[PDB]
Ligand binder design. Structure first.
Ligand SMILES: [Br-]
Ligand SMILES: [Br-]
Ligand SMILES: [Br-]
Ligand SMILES: [Br-]
Ligand SMILES: [Br-]
Ligand SMILES: [Br-]
Ligand SMILES: [Br-]
Ligand SMILES: [Br-]
Ligand SMILES: [Br-]
Ligand SMILES: [Br-]
Ligand SMILES: [Br-]
Ligand SMILES: [Br-]
Ligand SMILES: [Br-]
Ligand SMILES: [Br-]
Ligand SMILES: [Br-]
Ligand SMILES: [Br-]
Ligand SMILES: [Br-]
Ligand SMILES: [Br-]
Ligand SMILES: [Br-]
Ligand SMILES: [Br-]
Ligand SMILES: [Br-]
Ligand SMILES: [Br-]
Ligand SMILES: [Br-]
Ligand SMILES: [Br-]
Ligand SMILES: [Br-]
Ligand SMILES: [Br-]
Lengths: 167, 258, 154
């Protein structure tokens, strides 16, 4: 395309929208994601390599919650929110008044974070090692364990999207 | 109102060995997206990004250095510009420097020193945008002992000029002491203590587990003893990260309650 | 060094794990047992030499250093070589609108890509990458180092 049109500079495409999203990545590379699309279904964690067909349901927009120091996660594709429910996480209609959709992220000394459900007082747990495509995501006591069958550390990572260089 | 701005702070811990990558990994992420900071205070800034450009503007109105630069966070064809106000205090090793990155140009700059002492304390460096003034501070490692007189001098600077009586100001940075420890000490200056409010996370802002990075502000819209009505909350700025944080400090943001 | 402010300690280089956003696998070094977590750690250090400015393309020159050794990531031997061999150890971080990074070698201006499990190569990626879009195969995450960590307590 032309960087200069006959009457003035012409705006090239360089999306800012992708900057608003990210992924929550486990130590095994698995990304917290919606699987069954209908609301209230359980969330799981699949690495990009085993979920290319999932698309943007794997990306989330992290925003401050209603309460100070808490965050909520809005799905890029579905617009629903991560919500603590029973012994795991689901996605449902967003509401700043639902404490179950608010999370406190506790930094670790490696720079990773532990995700704590504020309504439950429990942390998002998963099994790094799996005989299948995914890690099972649950909520359990926050001990910061980092074992093959039980880990609670997550990385705040780039979204799985085409990236545009800004150098 | 100060609350109209998304303000953040990060101690970059720059050095000759690692500096440029930190600006391009973390500082860039703190400024981007819909929730990026409008104003970011940086401590231990080291050298500015190599692509930053010095403007012709002169603000040097005293012994403490302060210069204006522009830095393009985007491409040449799709620029995304910010201004950087840089105080290169560390002439010895060029690492313990202060900077303020702002989307909007500063109308004026301010340098305020703490009480005279034999300790090499650092001054507060700040910029005014309209009726709001924003400072970046890096108090002394040993309990930020210079913090109380620094805050008091900033207070008297604006609240003791006619036009300064309506200014709101925010002091943000590495205080090197717990928020409660600072709060108690400030009580020795009743007028300052009653006209300010400390806004800080309750989560660690440094890998030692300590809470060292936060803010203290004076909202001209609120009366004495009523600053706690401020609707600005502090939070680790984790919503901006997409990478490892390249220093032992976690960035902290100050945003209006939703 | 002789800083004007001695109350401020000098901080060492940041620790990271480098992962392909396509495979999510961390790039490993051979200095530690493959099952030891330090095999997934690197120290990120900035390169200060000026011999690679022509193809820098506005990125940041760095080296990925092994913890506790003068070895750096490289497309040689088993994945590392002496850090002094700058032609093979100096790489170039290119920021993007997502927080992911493209990584080029400083000498040739080629891009590091990973299109599949344990696939890692340095291939031509045209001229300047400014404003161009790239699939995950070209994207890298500079993330917290893999392994144990402790929840910070105030
Ligand atoms: Br045209
Ligand atoms: Br666009
Ligand atoms: Br997008
Ligand atoms: Br479905
Ligand atoms: Br539904
Ligand atoms: Br299910
Ligand atoms: Br918000
Ligand atoms: Br609250
Ligand atoms: Br979408
Ligand atoms: Br159920
Ligand atoms: Br945006
Ligand atoms: Br001065
Ligand atoms: Br510029
Ligand atoms: Br361009
Ligand atoms: Br402006
Ligand atoms: Br001073
Ligand atoms: Br310090
Ligand atoms: Br406290
Ligand atoms: Br008013
Ligand atoms: Br009071
Ligand atoms: Br807000
Ligand atoms: Br692996
Ligand atoms: Br060695
Ligand atoms: Br070494
Ligand atoms: Br080519
Ligand atoms: Br722990």
């Amino acid at each position: 395309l032309n960087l200069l049109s006959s009457s003035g500079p012409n705006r090239q495409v360089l999306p800012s929208e992708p900057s608003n999203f990210m992924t929550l990545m486990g130590q095994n590379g698995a990304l917290l994601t919606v699987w069954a699309l209908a609301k209230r279904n359980w969330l799981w964690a699949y690495p990009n390599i085993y979920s290319q067909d999932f698309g943007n349901i794997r990306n989330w927009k992290m925003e401050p919650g209603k309460h100070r120091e808490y965050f909520r996660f809005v799905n890029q594709s579905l617009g629903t929110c991560v919500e603590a429910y029973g012994n795991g996480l689901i996605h449902d209609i967003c509401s700043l008044d639902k404490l179950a959709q608010e999370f406190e992220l506790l930094p670790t000394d490696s720079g990773a974070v532990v995700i704590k459900s504020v309504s439950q007082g429990r942390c998002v747990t998963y099994n790094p090692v799996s005989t299948t495509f995914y890690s099972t995501v649950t909520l359990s006591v926050c001990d910061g364990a980092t074992e093959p069958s039980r880990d609670q550390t997550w990385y705040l990572a780039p979204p799985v999207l085409e990236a545009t260089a800004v150098n | 109102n100060l609350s109209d701005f998304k303000v953040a702070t990060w101690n970059l811990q720059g050095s000759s060995a690692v500096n440029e990558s930190k600006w391009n990994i973390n500082v860039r992420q703190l400024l981007s997206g819909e929730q990026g900071a409008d104003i970011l205070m940086v401590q231990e800034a080291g050298s500015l990004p190599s692509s930053a450009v010095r403007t012709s503007r002169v603000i040097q109105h005293g012994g403490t250095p302060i210069e204006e630069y522009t830095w393009n966070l985007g491409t040449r064809s799709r620029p995304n510009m910010v201004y950087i106000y840089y105080s290169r205090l560390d002439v010895g090793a060029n690492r313990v420097n202060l900077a303020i990155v702002s989307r909007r140009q500063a109308d004026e700059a301010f340098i305020v020193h703490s009480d005279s002492s034999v300790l090499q304390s650092r001054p507060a460096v700040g910029i005014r945008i309209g009726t709001d003034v924003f400072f970046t501070v890096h108090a002394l490692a040993t309990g930020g002992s210079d913090a109380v007189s620094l805050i008091r001098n900033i207070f008297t600077t604006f609240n003791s000029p006619p036009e300064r009586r309506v200014y709101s100001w925010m002091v943000v940075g590495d205080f090197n002491r717990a928020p409660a420890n600072l709060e108690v000490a400030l009580r020795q200056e009743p007028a300052v203590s009653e006209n300010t409010i400390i806004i800080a996370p309750t989560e660690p802002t440094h890998r030692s587990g300590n809470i060292l990075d936060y803010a203290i502000l004076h909202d001209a819209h609120l009366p004495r003893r009523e600053q706690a009505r401020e609707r600005i909350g502090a939070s680790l700025m984790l919503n901006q990260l997409r990478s490892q944080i390249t220093s032992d400090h976690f960035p902290v943001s100050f945003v209006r309650d939703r | 060094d002789p800083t004007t402010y001695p109350d401020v300690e000098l901080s060492p280089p940041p620790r990271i794990s480098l992962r392909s956003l396509l495979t999510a696998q961390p790039v490993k070094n051979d200095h530690y047992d493959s099952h030891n977590y330090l095999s997934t750690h690197w120290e990120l250090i900035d390169y200060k030499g000026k011999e690679y400015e022509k193809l820098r393309d506005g990125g940041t020159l760095v080296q990925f250093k092994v913890v506790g050794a003068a070895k750096c990531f490289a497309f040689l031997g088993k994945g590392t070589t002496d850090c002094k061999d700058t032609d093979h150890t100096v790489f170039n971080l290119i920021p993007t609108n997502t927080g992911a990074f493209l990584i080029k070698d400083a000498l040739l201006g080629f891009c590091i890509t990973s299109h599949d499990f344990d696939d890692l190569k340095l291939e031509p990626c045209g001229g300047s990458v400014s404003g161009r879009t790239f699939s995950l195969a070209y994207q890298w995450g500079i993330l917290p180092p893999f392994g144990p960590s402790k929840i910070l307590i105030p």
